[PDB]
Design a protein around this motif. Structure first.
Motif, PDB file in Angstrom:
ATOM      1  N   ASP A  16       0.819  -1.205   0.000  1.00  0.00           N
ATOM      2  CA  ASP A  16       0.000   0.000   0.000  1.00  0.00           C
ATOM      3  C   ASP A  16       0.854   1.257   0.000  1.00  0.00           C
ATOM      4  O   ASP A  16       0.499   2.242  -0.653  1.00  0.00           O
ATOM      5  CB  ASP A  16      -0.945   0.008   1.197  1.00  0.00           C
ATOM      6  N   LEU A  39       2.776   9.676  -7.437  1.00  0.00           N
ATOM      7  CA  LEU A  39       3.692  10.179  -8.442  1.00  0.00           C
ATOM      8  C   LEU A  39       2.980  10.333  -9.772  1.00  0.00           C
ATOM      9  O   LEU A  39       3.141  11.340 -10.449  1.00  0.00           O
ATOM     10  CB  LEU A  39       4.893   9.248  -8.590  1.00  0.00           C
ATOM     11  N   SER A  84      -0.187  10.841 -10.300  1.00  0.00           N
ATOM     12  CA  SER A  84      -1.114  11.960 -10.225  1.00  0.00           C
ATOM     13  C   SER A  84      -0.366  13.280 -10.367  1.00  0.00           C
ATOM     14  O   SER A  84      -0.833  14.193 -11.040  1.00  0.00           O
ATOM     15  CB  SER A  84      -1.925  11.912  -8.926  1.00  0.00           C
ATOM     16  N   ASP A  85       0.794  13.381  -9.727  1.00  0.00           N
ATOM     17  CA  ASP A  85       1.591  14.597  -9.808  1.00  0.00           C
ATOM     18  C   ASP A  85       2.070  14.840 -11.229  1.00  0.00           C
ATOM     19  O   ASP A  85       2.090  15.971 -11.700  1.00  0.00           O
ATOM     20  CB  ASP A  85       2.785  14.528  -8.856  1.00  0.00           C
ATOM     21  N   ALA A  95      -0.736  16.165 -13.734  1.00  0.00           N
ATOM     22  CA  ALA A  95      -1.151  17.563 -13.665  1.00  0.00           C
ATOM     23  C   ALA A  95      -0.252  18.455 -14.505  1.00  0.00           C
ATOM     24  O   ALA A  95      -0.687  19.513 -14.985  1.00  0.00           O
ATOM     25  CB  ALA A  95      -1.165  18.040 -12.219  1.00  0.00           C
ATOM     26  N   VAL A  96       1.003  18.044 -14.703  1.00  0.00           N
ATOM     27  CA  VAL A  96       1.931  18.830 -15.505  1.00  0.00           C
ATOM     28  C   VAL A  96       1.536  18.802 -16.978  1.00  0.00           C
ATOM     29  O   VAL A  96       1.788  19.764 -17.712  1.00  0.00           O
ATOM     30  CB  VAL A  96       3.362  18.323 -15.270  1.00  0.00           C
ATOM     31  N   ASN A 135      -1.612  18.937 -17.914  1.00  0.00           N
ATOM     32  CA  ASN A 135      -2.638  19.971 -17.970  1.00  0.00           C
ATOM     33  C   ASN A 135      -2.021  21.362 -17.957  1.00  0.00           C
ATOM     34  O   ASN A 135      -2.504  22.268 -18.654  1.00  0.00           O
ATOM     35  CB  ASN A 135      -3.613  19.815 -16.809  1.00  0.00           C
ATOM     36  N   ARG A 136      -0.950  21.543 -17.178  1.00  0.00           N
ATOM     37  CA  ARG A 136      -0.238  22.819 -17.168  1.00  0.00           C
ATOM     38  C   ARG A 136       0.360  23.135 -18.534  1.00  0.00           C
ATOM     39  O   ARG A 136       0.253  24.268 -19.020  1.00  0.00           O
ATOM     40  CB  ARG A 136       0.859  22.805 -16.114  1.00  0.00           C
ATOM     41  N   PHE A 137       0.954  22.135 -19.182  1.00  0.00           N
ATOM     42  CA  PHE A 137       1.549  22.355 -20.495  1.00  0.00           C
ATOM     43  C   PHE A 137       0.492  22.591 -21.563  1.00  0.00           C
ATOM     44  O   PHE A 137       0.700  23.397 -22.473  1.00  0.00           O
ATOM     45  CB  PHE A 137       2.416  21.168 -20.876  1.00  0.00           C
ATOM     46  N   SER A 159      -2.503  24.001 -21.094  1.00  0.00           N
ATOM     47  CA  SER A 159      -3.013  25.353 -20.935  1.00  0.00           C
ATOM     48  C   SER A 159      -1.979  26.394 -21.338  1.00  0.00           C
ATOM     49  O   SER A 159      -2.343  27.445 -21.875  1.00  0.00           O
ATOM     50  CB  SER A 159      -3.449  25.579 -19.502  1.00  0.00           C
ATOM     51  N   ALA A 160      -0.691  26.110 -21.125  1.00  0.00           N
ATOM     52  CA  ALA A 160       0.347  27.023 -21.588  1.00  0.00           C
ATOM     53  C   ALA A 160       0.402  27.080 -23.109  1.00  0.00           C
ATOM     54  O   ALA A 160       0.661  28.141 -23.679  1.00  0.00           O
ATOM     55  CB  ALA A 160       1.703  26.612 -21.021  1.00  0.00           C
ATOM     56  N   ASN A 190      -2.386  29.184 -24.235  1.00  0.00           N
ATOM     57  CA  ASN A 190      -2.055  30.580 -23.966  1.00  0.00           C
ATOM     58  C   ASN A 190      -1.134  31.144 -25.041  1.00  0.00           C
ATOM     59  O   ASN A 190      -1.358  32.251 -25.555  1.00  0.00           O
ATOM     60  CB  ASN A 190      -1.414  30.694 -22.588  1.00  0.00           C
ATOM     61  N   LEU A 191      -0.085  30.392 -25.390  1.00  0.00           N
ATOM     62  CA  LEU A 191       0.902  30.881 -26.349  1.00  0.00           C
ATOM     63  C   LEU A 191       0.331  30.997 -27.750  1.00  0.00           C
ATOM     64  O   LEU A 191       0.808  31.822 -28.532  1.00  0.00           O
ATOM     65  CB  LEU A 191       2.127  29.973 -26.376  1.00  0.00           C
ATOM     66  N   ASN A 193      -2.789  32.125 -28.576  1.00  0.00           N
ATOM     67  CA  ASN A 193      -3.442  33.425 -28.659  1.00  0.00           C
ATOM     68  C   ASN A 193      -2.454  34.570 -28.492  1.00  0.00           C
ATOM     69  O   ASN A 193      -2.646  35.637 -29.090  1.00  0.00           O
ATOM     70  CB  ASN A 193      -4.550  33.518 -27.616  1.00  0.00           C
ATOM     71  N   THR A 194      -1.380  34.372 -27.720  1.00  0.00           N
ATOM     72  CA  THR A 194      -0.380  35.429 -27.617  1.00  0.00           C
ATOM     73  C   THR A 194       0.386  35.603 -28.926  1.00  0.00           C
ATOM     74  O   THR A 194       0.690  36.736 -29.319  1.00  0.00           O
ATOM     75  CB  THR A 194       0.576  35.148 -26.467  1.00  0.00           C
TER      76      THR A 194
END
Lengths: 101, 51, 117, 50
Positions: free
Chosen positions: B19, B28, B30-31, B34-35, B37-39, B41-42, B45-46, B48-49
Protein backbone atom coordinates in the motif's frame (compact mmCIF):
# COMPACT_ATOMS: atom_id res chain seq x y z
CA UNK A 1 -1.14 73.10 -41.29
CA UNK A 2 -3.52 72.52 -38.39
CA UNK A 3 -5.50 69.98 -40.37
CA UNK A 4 -2.40 68.04 -41.35
CA UNK A 5 -1.37 67.84 -37.72
CA UNK A 6 -4.81 66.63 -36.71
CA UNK A 7 -4.88 64.04 -39.46
CA UNK A 8 -1.48 62.72 -38.47
CA UNK A 9 -2.46 62.59 -34.82
CA UNK A 10 -5.78 60.93 -35.50
CA UNK A 11 -4.31 58.18 -37.67
CA UNK A 12 -1.47 57.53 -35.25
CA UNK A 13 -3.97 57.71 -32.42
CA UNK A 14 -6.09 55.17 -34.30
CA UNK A 15 -2.94 52.96 -34.78
CA UNK A 16 -2.24 52.91 -31.04
CA UNK A 17 -5.86 52.16 -30.13
CA UNK A 18 -5.76 48.89 -32.09
CA UNK A 19 -2.88 47.96 -29.79
CA UNK A 20 -5.10 48.56 -26.77
CA UNK A 21 -7.57 46.03 -28.18
CA UNK A 22 -4.71 43.59 -28.73
CA UNK A 23 -3.62 43.98 -25.11
CA UNK A 24 -7.19 43.39 -23.94
CA UNK A 25 -7.38 40.22 -26.04
CA UNK A 26 -4.07 38.99 -24.67
CA UNK A 27 -5.28 39.54 -21.11
CA UNK A 28 -8.54 37.77 -21.94
CA UNK A 29 -6.75 34.66 -23.16
CA UNK A 30 -4.90 34.38 -19.87
CA UNK A 31 -8.07 35.16 -17.97
CA UNK A 32 -9.96 32.51 -19.91
CA UNK A 33 -7.28 29.95 -19.05
CA UNK A 34 -7.51 30.95 -15.39
CA UNK A 35 -11.28 30.57 -15.50
CA UNK A 36 -10.94 27.11 -17.01
CA UNK A 37 -8.57 26.10 -14.23
CA UNK A 38 -11.00 27.51 -11.66
CA UNK A 39 -13.96 25.55 -13.02
CA UNK A 40 -12.07 22.33 -12.43
CA UNK A 41 -11.15 23.38 -8.91
CA UNK A 42 -14.78 24.01 -8.02
CA UNK A 43 -15.81 20.62 -9.36
CA UNK A 44 -13.00 18.97 -7.39
CA UNK A 45 -14.17 20.73 -4.22
CA UNK A 46 -17.67 19.42 -4.80
CA UNK A 47 -16.31 15.90 -5.25
CA UNK A 48 -14.12 16.31 -2.15
CA UNK A 49 -17.04 17.24 0.12
CA UNK A 50 -18.64 13.74 0.43
CA UNK A 51 -18.12 11.87 3.74
CA UNK A 52 -16.98 8.92 1.63
CA UNK A 53 -13.79 10.23 0.05
CA UNK A 54 -10.79 8.96 1.99
CA UNK A 55 -7.90 11.12 3.10
CA UNK A 56 -5.67 9.43 0.53
CA UNK A 57 -8.20 10.82 -1.96
CA UNK A 58 -8.00 14.30 -0.46
CA UNK A 59 -4.21 14.27 -0.77
CA UNK A 60 -4.47 13.79 -4.54
CA UNK A 61 -7.26 16.36 -4.90
CA UNK A 62 -5.14 18.84 -2.94
CA UNK A 63 -2.16 18.03 -5.17
CA UNK A 64 -4.29 18.90 -8.21
CA UNK A 65 -5.63 22.06 -6.57
CA UNK A 66 -2.16 23.34 -5.65
CA UNK A 67 -0.91 22.60 -9.16
CA UNK A 68 -3.81 24.54 -10.70
CA UNK A 69 -3.20 27.46 -8.34
CA UNK A 70 0.54 27.43 -9.09
CA UNK A 71 -0.45 27.55 -12.75
CA UNK A 72 -2.78 30.56 -12.37
CA UNK A 73 0.01 32.19 -10.38
CA UNK A 74 2.50 31.52 -13.19
CA UNK A 75 0.38 32.47 -16.22
CA UNK A 76 -0.47 35.81 -14.63
CA UNK A 77 2.94 36.39 -13.08
CA UNK A 78 4.85 36.11 -16.37
CA UNK A 79 2.75 37.18 -19.32
CA UNK A 80 3.56 40.25 -21.33
CA UNK A 81 2.68 42.34 -24.33
CA UNK A 82 5.85 44.26 -25.30
CA UNK A 83 7.58 43.72 -21.97
CA UNK A 84 4.58 44.86 -19.93
CA UNK A 85 3.40 42.45 -17.22
CA UNK A 86 -0.37 42.85 -17.55
CA UNK A 87 -1.58 40.87 -14.50
CA UNK A 88 1.40 40.94 -12.13
CA UNK A 89 0.67 44.42 -10.79
CA UNK A 90 -2.25 46.85 -10.67
CA UNK A 91 -1.90 50.12 -12.58
CA UNK A 92 -3.54 52.26 -15.24
CA UNK A 93 -2.56 52.10 -18.87
CA UNK A 94 -3.55 55.32 -20.56
CA UNK A 95 -4.34 55.36 -24.24
CA UNK A 96 -3.69 58.47 -26.30
CA UNK A 97 -6.78 58.10 -28.52
CA UNK A 98 -6.92 61.55 -30.17
CA UNK A 99 -4.47 64.31 -31.19
CA UNK A 100 -5.64 66.15 -28.05
CA UNK A 101 -3.67 65.94 -24.80
CA UNK B 1 27.27 -0.26 -5.12
CA UNK B 2 23.61 -1.26 -4.47
CA UNK B 3 21.73 -4.57 -4.76
CA UNK B 4 18.53 -5.62 -3.01
CA UNK B 5 19.64 -7.29 0.19
CA UNK B 6 18.28 -10.74 0.84
CA UNK B 7 15.47 -10.37 3.36
CA UNK B 8 16.63 -10.82 6.94
CA UNK B 9 13.28 -12.33 7.86
CA UNK B 10 9.75 -12.86 6.56
CA UNK B 11 7.96 -9.49 6.19
CA UNK B 12 5.73 -8.81 9.26
CA UNK B 13 3.12 -7.04 7.05
CA UNK B 14 3.07 -7.92 3.28
CA UNK B 15 0.19 -5.42 2.70
CA UNK B 16 1.31 -2.22 4.49
CA UNK B 17 4.45 -2.39 2.34
CA UNK B 18 2.58 -2.62 -0.96
CA UNK B 19 0.00 0.00 0.00
CA UNK B 20 2.91 2.37 0.65
CA UNK B 21 4.43 1.51 -2.75
CA UNK B 22 1.08 2.02 -4.50
CA UNK B 23 0.67 5.35 -2.71
CA UNK B 24 4.12 6.49 -3.77
CA UNK B 25 3.48 5.31 -7.33
CA UNK B 26 -0.12 6.48 -7.55
CA UNK B 27 0.81 9.81 -6.03
CA UNK B 28 3.69 10.18 -8.44
CA UNK B 29 1.45 9.43 -11.39
CA UNK B 30 -1.11 11.96 -10.23
CA UNK B 31 1.59 14.60 -9.81
CA UNK B 32 2.96 13.84 -13.27
CA UNK B 33 -0.42 14.07 -14.94
CA UNK B 34 -1.15 17.56 -13.67
CA UNK B 35 1.93 18.83 -15.51
CA UNK B 36 0.34 17.74 -18.78
CA UNK B 37 -2.64 19.97 -17.97
CA UNK B 38 -0.24 22.82 -17.17
CA UNK B 39 1.55 22.36 -20.50
CA UNK B 40 -1.73 22.12 -22.43
CA UNK B 41 -3.01 25.35 -20.94
CA UNK B 42 0.35 27.02 -21.59
CA UNK B 43 0.13 25.95 -25.24
CA UNK B 44 -3.37 27.40 -25.61
CA UNK B 45 -2.06 30.58 -23.97
CA UNK B 46 0.90 30.88 -26.35
CA UNK B 47 -1.33 30.35 -29.38
CA UNK B 48 -3.44 33.42 -28.66
CA UNK B 49 -0.38 35.43 -27.62
CA UNK B 50 1.31 34.60 -30.94
CA UNK B 51 -1.86 35.58 -32.81
CA UNK C 1 16.92 -1.98 22.89
CA UNK C 2 19.02 1.20 22.88
CA UNK C 3 17.66 4.40 21.33
CA UNK C 4 19.72 5.57 18.35
CA UNK C 5 22.11 8.31 19.33
CA UNK C 6 21.38 11.48 17.48
CA UNK C 7 24.54 12.57 15.72
CA UNK C 8 26.15 15.98 15.89
CA UNK C 9 24.57 16.17 12.46
CA UNK C 10 21.00 15.95 13.79
CA UNK C 11 21.58 18.23 16.79
CA UNK C 12 23.53 20.83 14.79
CA UNK C 13 21.46 20.90 11.60
CA UNK C 14 18.30 20.90 13.66
CA UNK C 15 19.69 23.61 15.92
CA UNK C 16 20.67 25.99 13.13
CA UNK C 17 17.62 25.11 11.07
CA UNK C 18 14.94 25.29 13.74
CA UNK C 19 13.63 25.78 17.29
CA UNK C 20 16.35 26.32 19.91
CA UNK C 21 19.57 24.58 20.92
CA UNK C 22 18.30 23.38 24.30
CA UNK C 23 15.22 21.76 22.76
CA UNK C 24 17.24 20.43 19.82
CA UNK C 25 19.71 18.65 22.07
CA UNK C 26 16.79 16.92 23.74
CA UNK C 27 15.17 15.42 20.64
CA UNK C 28 15.80 11.78 19.71
CA UNK C 29 14.93 9.86 16.55
CA UNK C 30 11.47 8.28 16.24
CA UNK C 31 9.62 6.71 13.30
CA UNK C 32 6.43 8.53 12.34
CA UNK C 33 3.19 6.68 11.69
CA UNK C 34 0.07 8.66 10.83
CA UNK C 35 -3.39 7.33 11.71
CA UNK C 36 -6.58 8.42 9.95
CA UNK C 37 -10.05 8.76 11.44
CA UNK C 38 -11.06 5.35 9.99
CA UNK C 39 -8.44 3.09 11.54
CA UNK C 40 -5.67 2.20 9.15
CA UNK C 41 -2.28 3.58 10.05
CA UNK C 42 0.01 4.92 7.36
CA UNK C 43 3.72 4.69 7.93
CA UNK C 44 5.93 7.68 7.17
CA UNK C 45 9.61 8.48 7.14
CA UNK C 46 11.97 9.29 9.97
CA UNK C 47 11.94 12.50 11.97
CA UNK C 48 13.80 14.33 14.73
CA UNK C 49 11.52 15.08 17.67
CA UNK C 50 12.90 18.42 18.86
CA UNK C 51 10.68 19.60 21.67
CA UNK C 52 7.26 18.57 20.41
CA UNK C 53 7.83 19.60 16.80
CA UNK C 54 8.67 16.84 14.26
CA UNK C 55 11.82 17.11 12.14
CA UNK C 56 12.10 15.55 8.72
CA UNK C 57 15.30 13.82 9.37
CA UNK C 58 16.43 10.67 7.50
CA UNK C 59 18.01 7.67 9.12
CA UNK C 60 20.38 5.35 7.21
CA UNK C 61 20.21 1.58 8.00
CA UNK C 62 24.05 1.36 7.78
CA UNK C 63 26.10 2.94 10.64
CA UNK C 64 24.00 5.54 12.51
CA UNK C 65 23.95 8.53 10.11
CA UNK C 66 20.88 10.79 10.74
CA UNK C 67 20.68 13.27 7.85
CA UNK C 68 18.86 16.54 8.38
CA UNK C 69 17.05 18.08 5.40
CA UNK C 70 17.17 21.80 4.84
CA UNK C 71 15.45 24.03 2.33
CA UNK C 72 18.26 26.62 1.81
CA UNK C 73 16.35 29.80 0.95
CA UNK C 74 17.89 33.28 1.08
CA UNK C 75 16.08 35.22 3.82
CA UNK C 76 15.88 38.86 4.97
CA UNK C 77 18.86 39.87 2.77
CA UNK C 78 21.05 37.13 4.25
CA UNK C 79 22.40 34.49 1.89
CA UNK C 80 21.81 30.77 2.45
CA UNK C 81 20.07 30.81 5.83
CA UNK C 82 18.53 27.30 5.94
CA UNK C 83 15.63 26.01 8.12
CA UNK C 84 14.55 22.56 9.39
CA UNK C 85 11.50 20.61 8.17
CA UNK C 86 8.20 20.87 10.05
CA UNK C 87 5.79 17.90 10.07
CA UNK C 88 2.74 20.17 10.55
CA UNK C 89 0.18 21.47 8.01
CA UNK C 90 -3.46 20.36 7.98
CA UNK C 91 -2.74 16.70 7.26
CA UNK C 92 0.31 16.96 9.49
CA UNK C 93 2.33 14.69 7.21
CA UNK C 94 3.86 17.71 5.41
CA UNK C 95 6.97 19.73 6.47
CA UNK C 96 6.64 23.48 7.33
CA UNK C 97 9.64 25.83 6.79
CA UNK C 98 9.16 28.64 9.33
CA UNK C 99 10.59 31.90 8.02
CA UNK C 100 10.20 35.11 10.09
CA UNK C 101 7.45 33.46 12.14
CA UNK C 102 5.46 32.65 8.99
CA UNK C 103 5.12 29.09 7.72
CA UNK C 104 5.60 28.49 4.00
CA UNK C 105 5.75 25.20 2.14
CA UNK C 106 9.13 23.60 1.57
CA UNK C 107 8.74 23.23 -2.22
CA UNK C 108 6.94 26.62 -2.46
CA UNK C 109 9.92 28.08 -0.57
CA UNK C 110 12.54 25.86 -2.26
CA UNK C 111 15.28 28.28 -3.47
CA UNK C 112 12.86 31.25 -3.17
CA UNK C 113 14.33 34.76 -2.57
CA UNK C 114 12.17 36.35 0.18
CA UNK C 115 14.50 39.40 -0.21
CA UNK C 116 13.17 40.00 -3.77
CA UNK C 117 9.42 39.30 -3.19
CA UNK D 1 -2.89 -23.44 4.13
CA UNK D 2 -0.37 -22.51 1.46
CA UNK D 3 2.66 -24.77 1.71
CA UNK D 4 6.24 -23.55 1.64
CA UNK D 5 6.68 -25.06 -1.81
CA UNK D 6 3.86 -22.68 -2.76
CA UNK D 7 5.61 -19.73 -1.15
CA UNK D 8 8.78 -20.48 -3.11
CA UNK D 9 6.90 -20.06 -6.40
CA UNK D 10 5.05 -16.95 -5.21
CA UNK D 11 8.39 -15.45 -4.15
CA UNK D 12 9.86 -16.37 -7.55
CA UNK D 13 7.02 -14.44 -9.21
CA UNK D 14 7.40 -11.49 -6.83
CA UNK D 15 11.15 -11.20 -7.41
CA UNK D 16 10.62 -11.40 -11.17
CA UNK D 17 8.02 -8.62 -11.05
CA UNK D 18 10.32 -6.47 -8.92
CA UNK D 19 13.27 -7.11 -11.25
CA UNK D 20 10.97 -6.00 -14.06
CA UNK D 21 9.94 -2.73 -12.37
CA UNK D 22 13.63 -2.18 -11.67
CA UNK D 23 14.49 -2.73 -15.34
CA UNK D 24 11.69 -0.74 -17.00
CA UNK D 25 12.53 2.28 -14.86
CA UNK D 26 16.28 1.80 -14.94
CA UNK D 27 16.55 1.84 -18.74
CA UNK D 28 13.83 3.93 -20.32
CA UNK D 29 14.59 7.13 -22.15
CA UNK D 30 13.21 9.95 -24.21
CA UNK D 31 16.12 11.34 -26.28
CA UNK D 32 18.81 9.74 -24.14
CA UNK D 33 17.33 11.01 -20.87
CA UNK D 34 16.72 8.38 -18.19
CA UNK D 35 13.42 9.61 -16.77
CA UNK D 36 13.03 7.32 -13.72
CA UNK D 37 16.60 6.25 -12.93
CA UNK D 38 17.47 9.44 -11.05
CA UNK D 39 15.66 12.33 -9.39
CA UNK D 40 16.12 15.80 -10.91
CA UNK D 41 14.21 18.75 -12.33
CA UNK D 42 13.57 19.18 -16.01
CA UNK D 43 12.93 22.82 -16.74
CA UNK D 44 10.77 23.82 -19.66
CA UNK D 45 11.39 27.09 -21.45
CA UNK D 46 7.70 27.85 -22.10
CA UNK D 47 7.88 31.54 -23.15
CA UNK D 48 10.38 33.88 -24.85
CA UNK D 49 11.14 35.20 -21.35
CA UNK D 50 14.10 33.89 -19.35
Amino acid sequence: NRFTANIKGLTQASRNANDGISIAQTTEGALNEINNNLQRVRELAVQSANSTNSQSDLDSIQAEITQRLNEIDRVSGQTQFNGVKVLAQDNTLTIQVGAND
Amino acid sequence: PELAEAAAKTTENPLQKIDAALAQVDALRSDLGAVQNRFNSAITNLGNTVN
Amino acid sequence: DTPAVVSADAKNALIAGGVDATDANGAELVKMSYTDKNGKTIEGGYALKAGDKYYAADYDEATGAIKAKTTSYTAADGTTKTAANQLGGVDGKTEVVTIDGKTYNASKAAGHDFKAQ
